[PDB]
Design a protein around this ligand. Structure first.
Ligand code: NOJ
Ligand code: NOJ
Ligand code: NOJ
Ligand code: MG
Ligand code: MG
Ligand code: MG
Ligand code: MG
Lengths: 781, 206, 206
């Protein structure tokens, strides 16, 4: 069995740099607390025992209420009068830092307005190892850079709005199967322990840990340790994971909270780096363990100060208002137990926090549409004589937009996946609705919507008369506690749901101007229809939230040129992706073993390595205009040589070998600041190229910079930077970025540091991972 | 919920069959999930200590319904003998050590359980448990001091014997004829018999 | 549709089992809905006059499939003897009187029908039609020359005799064993028999 070595003591905060003010105030607060009060900050109150998805204990003596921790990564869960934003995978498809930031801000606003202290998101774990992983859509992209950049922007948005963000799930939670034994037992599996994600040190550093480093460096206030084990130690009591990787190497200054009921070694978890136990025994035992010296006072002091530093860092002292909604009822009033008898109290204020957030949701919707094919199908005008709309995915959830709890169904248009990663829709504009409005406000031609996937006779009938047929298909997935159609969180296949492929084929056989819109959580196998000559256009539109239909028509009818690029690969087969899902336990009754044997070769890296050609490669998308790439130029910057970090920490302040050691500790060679040794972010090269709009309409291009690191075990290419750029017809721009030292380095397990190998490196600039228009060597120095 | 039942109603209605059960020599009682007069059955001293164990002089053991709420160690004082399904074991041990629960009580709990055991002759009739509630698999894994043991979990012991006979007979004996204006009995020589209703047919899922 | 079949194929394949039918003494033929070489079977003189009634020398009567299209009176000349289900009556009468259908043709049509009748002994075995195709009701109305009569329309005559035996036997003999790798036969002493598939179960509508 793969093994996780111990690493103690649990590092205490430095409170240097951007964390100094927050640390100073956290220290002044914690100094005033009893042991009991400090412990309260670390202890969840109990599942459904208060208002939020999780709450800490309070400190009434100082008029300090317990923190409110609330889902989700795309909105405020279990709340009324809130917005439903596009999923993270949609954000990834925008390739747009600014939009990710603004989505974060708006979500932050909504959480703040409700009294939430901690938004439980965004997500960089799962990263996206498996194309059929159930919760990938909550995150961004299998690519660590795309994910890391947009993760960071999202965090800055949330925290700038005055709410603590929570990077989750740390780490290796790449599938839902066997994530939690009780859950697996519910599915008829006999195991007593969560699966172990077995990840080698190199793979961790270069893939899964990378976006979490970005999260740390972006100033995220909290992390959530995952349900699964990593090398046969539960994330939430994995000393190597938390004490070494997170709190030493990445020098995380904030607090680590457990996933809800994520198994840990109680008091041992605290020594291994856990700061907060959710949802709530730990309170009492922590108090006792401090009193008898099993847990040193500086540990509990550090737990409390991390929590309070996060609080002050985002300005919770300024922005906090009373929690004005209840997670567990929509009723205005409810009975509560009193010291004597009961009271009848206000539990929901129905505070409307939506503001103008429908605009940014429509915009991100449009920006996340990816044009995969267009042989003269798009844009439409709205003056078409006869428009046919086809597929259940065009239509309404007949149970109401919030008719499936936690969105645990696939009724009507798919705008959101299922599980904790959800929010209630204030409304839902369907494609059927938006398309009919478009026509009836313009040319007022014929339009008919056949939204029963079994009604094939009607689809032929209508398609054969149509000037254009717009076909809607979907594929759904979500968190493991919900099973839909035999998908136990994870997808059981990469097929279109509800006979979608049949809908496409039926319509395309009858209409030679067929448009296909895919609302999918991830890739599906399209080999059998994408190349159908009668299919004149194909878009992926993902999970667009409340404005789905409107955001779509803005693109389809040409008000917005599509500018998204696919943030994952569309392969010919499931086998193309490699990394099959473990769906049968392989360690008897013990922890199943998901070995990450493919290393860094997931998604496009795998395709490139094995020379499999994608149908649509990572980073690919079309426009209503054309772009041209020219004149790459590489400038060496002659950065200072890399210095491994060195020296000591301070002694642990007060306000398993080494676990009670509060003496000064040696700094790790790759640590020394939040996000890693600062020398890693030194700029080594400046790289430029010219992008020109050679077409006839204004449009966005997403230029992409890839690096070949040049070793035999390196990917042929890895994404390193990108931007989204609006260009008028004929307009040119010089796209200039820099490559950091980290950008051109490899992880060396022996030296425990990032190294620039002697293999020659090549830089590429292009429009996708396969359309590498420009290249130049990176000259060593 | 609290079932609020006066003393007379209890004695003349709900308790009566339970008295019959005691007197028939029943080895165990299971205390219910609900409360009676705002005390949970499994920690209701009036119910268990007074009515069951004094007035009805029950000699066997009281087990809780599965997760039937009680005041932990105080349940034992109130007449509970066995906690199902389970985290009170170490708490009962402690309560005995610190004197909150007398020795004679834990002793009486143990001896009630064993008394029931010997009363029906478990000592003569016990055989290993040869089936598993949670799987039909023949084998399965169990954790060990080190690694795992692969063990037999179902022996598929056929215990049905001839009990289909009594099940058929009781089926027939439990038919109640509520109306008959020349409808029954039938002969089997009817020219055309219609059978109507899903309640006549098979469970299509097995 | 026109089934286009060459002379050799007809003779060596499709016609062959019909020759056997003729030779078995079959009393009637039914001409088909389709065309053969672009002439409707029921008005196809090559098919009825030549192949069936000359070469195969069929002595019985040809009846049309129900509403099988034909050239009216012209069909009679092409070898049709009976038009089902039924304008042809009076047109045929007319055609005889005005000379378009020879007296000998109609005479032959009638004698073919009556020949079939006597060949199987309908004169001996005919009984009243004692059921109705269109209702299961015992009685019904029929129009009289004045008013209506209420008449028996179904007698529910049970003709099944012992025919369940032959049906069971032919059932068994028509079973084809395509594969057997130690699977069959069974004994009825299997510990656990699973039956699977809707094709095992009842038509829930009766
Ligand atoms: O609902 C709270 C918590 N439950 C479990 C999920 O894994 C996590 O993402 C979520 O934040
Ligand atoms: O299944 C165990 C237990 N569950 C609860 C029921 O109330 C009880 O009758 C049953 O014996
Ligand atoms: O039911 C009358 C008649 N209808 C048409 C069929 O083809 C034929 O076989 C049948 O005898
Ligand atoms: Mg409540
Ligand atoms: Mg540090
Ligand atoms: Mg007594
Ligand atoms: Mg002749």
């Amino acid at each position: 069995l793969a093994y996780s070595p111990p690493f103690y003591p649990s590092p205490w905060m430095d409170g240097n740099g951007e964390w100094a003010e927050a640390y100073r105030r956290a220290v002044d607060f914690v100094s005033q607390l009893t042991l009991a009060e400090k412990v309260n900050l670390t202890t969840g109150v109990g599942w459904m025992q208060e208002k939020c998805v999780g709450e800490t204990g309070s400190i009434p003596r100082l008029g300090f209420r317990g923190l409110c921790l609330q889902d989700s990564p795309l909105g405020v869960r279990f709340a009324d009068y809130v917005s439903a934003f596009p999923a993270g995978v949609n954000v990834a498809a925008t390739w747009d830092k600014n939009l990710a930031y603004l989505r974060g801000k708006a979500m932050g606003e909504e959480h703040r307005g409700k009294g939430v202290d901690v938004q439980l998101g965004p997500v960089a774990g799962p990263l996206g190892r498996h194309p059929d992983g159930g919760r990938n859509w909550e995150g961004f992209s299998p690519d660590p850079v795309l994910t890391g950049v947009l993760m960071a922007e999202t965090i800055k948005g949330i925290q700038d709005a005055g709410v603590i963000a929570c990077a989750k799930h740390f780490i290796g939670n790449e599938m839902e199967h066997f994530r939690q034994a009780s859950e697996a037992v519910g599915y008829g599996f006999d195991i007593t322990e969560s699966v172990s994600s077995n990840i080698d040190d190199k793979t961790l550093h270069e893939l899964y840990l990378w976006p979490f480093a970005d999260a740390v460096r972006a100033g995220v206030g909290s992390f959530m340790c995952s349900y699964n084990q990593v090398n046969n130690s539960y994330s939430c009591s994995n000393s190597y994971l938390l004490n070494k990787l997170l709190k030493s190497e990445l020098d995380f200054q904030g607090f680590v909270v457990s996933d809800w009921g994520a198994h840990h070694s109680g008091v041992g978890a605290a020594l291994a780096g856990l700061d907060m136990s959710m949802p709530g025994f730990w309170g009492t035992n922590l108090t006792i363990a401090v009193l008898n010296g099993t847990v040193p006072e500086w540990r509990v002091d550090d737990m409390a100060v991390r929590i309070m530093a996060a609080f002050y860092k985002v300005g919770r002292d300024r922005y906090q208002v009373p929690v004005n909604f209840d997670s567990w009822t929509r009723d205005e009033y409810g009975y509560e137990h009193a010291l004597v008898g009961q009271n009848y109290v206000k539990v929901n204020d129905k505070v409307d926090v939506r503001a103008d957030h429908a605009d940014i949701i429509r915009q991100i919707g449009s920006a996340s549409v990816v044009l995969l094919k267009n042989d003269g199908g798009l844009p439409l005008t709205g003056y078409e004589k006869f428009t046919g709309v086809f597929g259940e995915d065009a239509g309404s959830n007949r149970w109401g937009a919030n008719g499936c709890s936690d969105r645990g169904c696939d009724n009507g248009t798919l705008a959101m996946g299922w599980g904790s990663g959800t929010a209630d829709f204030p409304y839902l504009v369907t494609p059927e609705q938006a398309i009919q409005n478009e026509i009836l406000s313009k040319g007022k031609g014929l339009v008919s919507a056949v939204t029963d996937n079994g009604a094939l006779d009607q689809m032929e009938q209508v398609a054969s008369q149509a000037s254009v047929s717009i076909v809607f298909v979907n594929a759904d997935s979500g968190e493991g506690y919900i099973c839909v159609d035999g998908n136990e969180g994870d997808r059981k296949n990469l097929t279109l749901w509800k006979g979608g492929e049949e809908v496409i084929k039926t319509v395309a056989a009858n209409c030679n101007n067929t448009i296909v819109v895919m609302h999918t959580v991830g890739p599906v196998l399209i080999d059998e229809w994408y190349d159908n000559p009668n299919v004149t256009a194909i878009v992926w539109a993902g999970l667009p939230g409340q404005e789905s239909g409107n955001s779509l028509v803005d693109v389809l009818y040409g008000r917005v040129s599509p500018g998204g690029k696919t943030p994952f690969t569309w392969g010919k087969t499931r086998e193309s992706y490699g990394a099959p899902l473990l769906t049968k336990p392989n360690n008897g009754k013990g922890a199943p073993q998901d070995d990450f044997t493919e290393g860094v070769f997931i998604d496009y890296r795998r395709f490139d390595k094995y020379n499999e050609t994608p149908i649509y490669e990572f980073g690919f998308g079309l426009s209503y205009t054309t772009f041209e790439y020219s004149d790459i130029y590489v400038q060496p910057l002659n950065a200072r040589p890399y210095t491994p970090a060195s020296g000591s920490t301070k002694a642990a302040p007060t306000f398993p070998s080494g676990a009670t050691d509060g003496s000064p500790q040696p700094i790790l060679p790759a640590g020394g600041a939040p996000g890693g040794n600062p020398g890693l972010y030194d700029e080594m090269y400046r790289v430029s190229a010219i992008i020109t709009n050679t077409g006839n309409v204004v449009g966005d291009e997403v230029p992409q910079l890839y690096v070949s690191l040049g070793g035999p075990d390196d990917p042929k290419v890895v994404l390193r930077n990108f931007d989204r750029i609006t260009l008028h017809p004929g307009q040119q721009t010089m796209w200039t970025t820099t490559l950091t030292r980290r950008d051109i380095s490899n992880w060396d397990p022996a030296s425990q540091n990032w190294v620039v190998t002697k293999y020659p490196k090549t830089v590429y600039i292009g429009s996708s991972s396969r359309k590498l228009h420009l290249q130049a060597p990176l000259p060593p120095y």
